[PDB]
Symmetry: D2
Subunit: 262 residues, 4 copies
């Protein structure tokens, strides 16, 4: 009795934050959801209850998306519990603010592996089932940082640009099938990833004042002067997964409050 | 009970506008328009919505004013503005008549400016609004013998960005939808999906843009092209 | 002896056009134009080039025809076309006068179309040509209170793409140059480099586009903005 | 007596092909050039003679750009022989045509490392000297595949998009200095990298006919129906290195014959 009823979806990362909203909105649309995260159980029970409040099957998994073996384990676990993976949301990623000169190479490697190559592993593993079933959705959670650059985020911007290019290529390789591949480019969304940066800014320039730090953080980049919600990103993902997006391929849905428009 | 129930919308052209109006009505909005077409327009009224027909030339600003006033007296304050008035003339730039260039700019580019200018104060007062501009992939990439059309679509996208920026802090959003083609070789040239884009899909994109989920979607494009612009 | 020696060029506006003409003359081209400005224009003739002044309203097509004929009789067949005619009006879209919107579109967008249409057959016959359209960063991103300007610049870039595609297989190329601002806070808002863009740099970009190295540069933008569009 | 006289430039890869043309045009502009390549000496003497025909100092080095130690060795060797690195042209890269499903992960890693991360290592190593000298140029040889996607080139498109995003970030981090960072996006250029693909296409669809294969290869993507030359890419690099590009930052110079315009 719902648009996504019976669909099995897999969110690869960000159990808290954007991944949470995406999972909630996919479950609201009737899809079973598997939430993957790099954490074990801080508040994961509350997250799973929030997702399962919509009466769909919900599962929780802990795979390091930098390890292809663990990505394959995640896919096979989803197949065992729910069924063939039909909606792959690649949302893993981290952030590290640093100028290029002092940017650690290990952090560059970590950001590339988690924000770019994990999507490659997950897509490579899930595409055969989607092709055999004749249907599939691959939604990559890119960033506005994948369309433009920001200071001291070289690795993140590179990985996000790369994830957009990968989206284009995958969409082209599947253009004639019922499988569509697209990307979402959110602006600032209040998440632990963004909360950490806000706290750093507050302690650096604003005497530890989180309110002023948040104000400056948004006013720098987002003309709307307000955060994008995880619910809105989830709505964008639901739209991309719906039949109306059957011919939406290789493009970007940007939810940024005007960040990129300027 | 629906996402768009209780909303007043106008489509300035059509026949993508027909599909946009149909999908908006299915979402609950009350829509205004501008042998088979008559059947489809009568069918649009079959979703419990107040649908009104109209025929206004969007080249004349006074006629746009008349359409807006007719909408706001017949149904109520305009809350969704779907600018879809457009004409296509295929010709090399050397032999492109200036009359058709002016007509294309007026109907595809300036008409949206007039309609937005007329409708914006009402949305400002009401604190909410959706301005959906029906551009095309020709507004992002170029195509041969489409000088006026591509220029108008690019300008429309630029105007979309500007309007969205000017209303970033309000409840009004402005965005553009860029469709592709709506037998095999013609699609193979431009659309790698080798299938057309239905008017229903464009209407779905418009409904999504008008839905609450797009409250923070401002000044960007929604490309429904089967991968045309991805290459 | 120079890269552009023996080339006939026209700049349709100015005062970036002055710098463009100066750098073109330094490269050896013979240029046509359209208290300190007089000194600079007299200085432009100090590079052994045949420089001619002119004052044509680019809104009227007949005046564009007159300028082209004057160029091709005074100096020779037009080989470089630098469209730089433009006017800026800053105003919110709600209060934006339609007259200024039409003027901006006519001077920034349609004038380039007329000039290109007039000049293209000569380049086709001669098998060579450069059409350099002076857009701006406002043609790529949006800015508040720049509705007409941003729309016109976006349309100009689209027309650039179309013209380049129509002449891909010939020796004629079409490209666009997008400059930024040409005290601290105003640059900090948009240009992260916090320094202006000289007219000399825009002229250098035009000279590069016109040089042989750009024989395969077609339909793209050259952005001289200190990083404005990179964010 | 030349625009780039006294400038020390380092080309990181593609000794044959685009790197050759870039080195030649930089030498013509008066700059000393160090050519780095993953090969030892097939025809490197002819390449060095072609570059040195313009009367500037020329050096040859063989560093694997996937190894940061070798990149540092290259930079230090340039400093020892010629002087501080002032014009860094990041041009290393390879290609591997394959659908996502069958794309080897090792080839993905190699393409990412050589086409994206090598630029990060070289830039990180060279930026301090440029900042201390108050001048510098960083030219990244991206591709049209960094602005759009092509089938069976997921790794290449991802890496090239990433290199463009990295260009944006580096330009932003140096916007107030005399150091500019930009990217060049060439279309098809007849090089061994492109010759190999052409030969594969010829043997696959055209009975081994290189002429028809080349025709189809160009007609697929480039409206101009002709190759971009290495000399033209070199000219774009020279323009980006010239004073006229003092305020060109974080942008792309696309030499593609109209590929991206459509």
């Amino acid at each position: 009795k719902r648009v996504l009823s019976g669909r099995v979806a897999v969110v690869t990362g960000s159990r808290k934050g954007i991944g949470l909203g995406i999972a909630m909105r996919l479950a609201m649309a009737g899809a079973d959801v598997v939430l993957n995260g790099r954490r074990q159980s801080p508040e994961d029970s509350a997250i799973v209850e929030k997702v399962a409040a919509y009466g769909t099957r919900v599962r929780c998994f802990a795979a390091n998306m930098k390890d292809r073996a663990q990505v394959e384990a995640l896919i096979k676990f989803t197949e065992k519990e729910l069924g063939a993976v039909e909606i792959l949301v690649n949302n893993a990623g981290i952030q590290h603010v640093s100028p290029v000169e002092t940017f650690p190479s290990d952090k560059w490697d970590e950001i590339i592996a988690l924000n770019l190559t994990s999507a490659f592993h997950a897509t490579q593993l899930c595409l055969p089932s989607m092709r055999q079933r004749g249907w599939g959705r691959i939604i990559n959670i890119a960033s506005v940082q994948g369309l433009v650059g920001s200071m001291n985020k070289s690795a993140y911007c590179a990985a996000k640009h790369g994830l957009i290019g990968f989206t284009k290529v995958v969409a082209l390789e599947t253009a004639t099938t019922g499988i569509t591949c697209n990307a979402i480019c959110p602006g600032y969304v209040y998440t632990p990833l963004v909360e950490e940066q806000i706290k750093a800014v507050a302690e650096a320039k604003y005497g530890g004042d989180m309110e002023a730090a948040t104000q400056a953080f948004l006013c720098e980049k987002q003309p709307a002067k307000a955060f994008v919600t995880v619910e809105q990103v989830g709505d964008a993902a639901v739209f991309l997964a719906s039949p109306g997006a059957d011919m939406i391929r290789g493009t970007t849905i940007t939810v940024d409050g005007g960040w990129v428009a300027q």
